[PDB]
């Protein structure tokens, strides 16, 4: 019976702010609640707070009390949370949940990316190939924020390929690899290229491999 | 805050198999707990509330229980649209507090690494700094330790290991172990080689080369 649906993802400036918004569709009556929860890339849920449709109550996690401000519309049946002064700690998709009778609903989630003042490109080195399949691939060392996005011979190379997760060095900085497996009888007749792009920095790094 | 414990971070099933997901809540929280899925990109999905109840939708296969402390989400008869993330919730006490999450992979055949080692590019010798990278390719089970000897003498703070999430096609596992070293250091030294165990292994392999060629 009820349909969340969240506004559009967020792109936006560190110390700025955004208002995320969540409607209900579905409800005839008021006497319903709004729970809104934090997820960061790759880690577990977060509760934020909730908001009682029926007469506008309020529960606040307390330490988001200052980061979010939870208000609600029941004329257009939405929710809203507003999340201030935006760090790096802000960058996650946000949830909206709710109940109704013995069901259960979710939002679409809503992403919001606070770019980073400081952004580095990757560097892409080569992993040159020194039984008879042999591996191949690009380091991507020391970028910054994330995402990067690996490509193997502007995708006619999928099969085999490994792109790891990123691992956040010691320096702040990003570092994964992207890695195929070939038959070793290619190494001397197929060019192999790596195709990076990492968008914050507008870097399109295409890198030749050969062993 | 209440902390909810999930100490199995990976399961491992097959399809028709039974599953149980612990949950251990450090204070009482009665039985307001509550159980989701998620699926990579999906949003969650809640399928329990008070430990044992059921959620609109949610087949008869998901049995919660618990009570107190310990809490468990039961999948009997493992269906492949089962294979997910699952996390339980306390609502019993302020802040609600979620678990760390379960991950339900799929049980296959033991598949050993296909291990591959990567000397530093003499591109990236011009930056100061040397890396070297040790592939585990396509293995199974999870578990996998790499060691970094260099010139046969133990690593130890300057090595990172990253795993890819398990493989829709053939359900194995990859790792890359990255060694990071100064190009001085790494040009005083002359072996470098990674250490491989691994449950398919039947003895431990070390993949290795000489600077130099
Ligand atoms: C942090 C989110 C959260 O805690 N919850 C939630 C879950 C999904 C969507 C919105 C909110 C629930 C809060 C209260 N329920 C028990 C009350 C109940 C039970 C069954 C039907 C209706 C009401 C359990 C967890």
């Known amino acids: 019976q009820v349909r969340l649906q969240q506004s559009g993802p967020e792109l936006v400036k560190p110390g700025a702010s955004v208002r995320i918004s969540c409607k209900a569709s579905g409800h005839t009556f008021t006497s319903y609640y709004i729970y809104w929860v934090k997820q960061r890339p790759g880690q577990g849920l977060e509760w934020i707070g909730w908001?009682?449709?029926?007469?506008?109550?309020?529960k606040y996690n307390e330490k988001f009390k200052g980061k979010a401000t939870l208000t609600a519309d029941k004329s257009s049946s939405t929710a809203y949370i507003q999340l201030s002064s935006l760090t790096s700690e802000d960058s996650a998709v946000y949830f909206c949940?709710?109940?109704?009778?013995?069901?259960?609903?979710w939002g679409q989630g809503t992403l919001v990316t606070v770019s980073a003042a400081s952004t580095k490109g990757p560097s892409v080195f080569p992993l040159a190939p020194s039984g008879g399949t042999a591996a191949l691939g690009c380091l991507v060392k020391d970028y910054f924020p994330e995402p990067v996005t690996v490509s193997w011979n502007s995708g006619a190379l999928t099969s085999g390929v490994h792109t790891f997760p990123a691992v956040l060095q010691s320096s702040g900085l990003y570092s994964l690899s992207s890695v195929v497996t070939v038959p070793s009888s290619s190494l001397g007749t197929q060019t192999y290229i790596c195709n990076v792009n990492h968008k914050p920095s507008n870097t399109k790094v295409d890198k030749r491999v050969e062993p | 805050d209440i902390v909810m414990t999930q100490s199995q971070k990976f399961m491992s099933t097959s399809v028709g198999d039974r599953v149980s997901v612990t949950c251990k809540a450090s204070?009482?929280?009665?039985?307001?707990v509550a159980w989701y899925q998620q699926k990579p990109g999906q949003s969650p999905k809640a399928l329990i509330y008070?430990?044992?109840y059921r959620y609109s939708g949610v087949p008869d296969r998901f049995t919660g229980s618990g009570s107190g402390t310990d809490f468990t989400l039961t999948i009997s008869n493992v269906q492949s649209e089962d294979l997910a993330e699952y996390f339980c919730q306390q609502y019993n006490s302020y802040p609600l507090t979620f678990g760390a999450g379960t991950k339900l992979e799929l049980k296959r055949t033991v598949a050993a690494p296909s291990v591959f080692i990567f000397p530093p590019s003499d591109e990236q010798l011009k930056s100061g700094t040397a890396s070297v990278v040790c592939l585990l390719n396509n293995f199974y089970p999870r578990e996998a330790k790499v060691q970094w000897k260099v010139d046969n003498a133990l690593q130890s703070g300057n090595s990172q290991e990253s795993v890819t999430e398990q493989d829709s096609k053939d359900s194995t596992y990859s790792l890359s172990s990255t060694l990071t070293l100064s190009k001085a250091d790494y040009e005083k030294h002359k072996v470098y080689a990674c250490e491989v165990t691994h449950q398919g292994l039947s003895s431990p392999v070390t993949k290795s080369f000489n600077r130099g060629e």
């Open positions: 204070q009482n929280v009665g039985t307001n």
């Open positions: 949940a709710s109940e109704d009778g013995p069901g259960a609903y």
């Open positions: 008070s430990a044992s």
């Open positions: 908001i009682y449709f029926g007469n506008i109550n309020l």
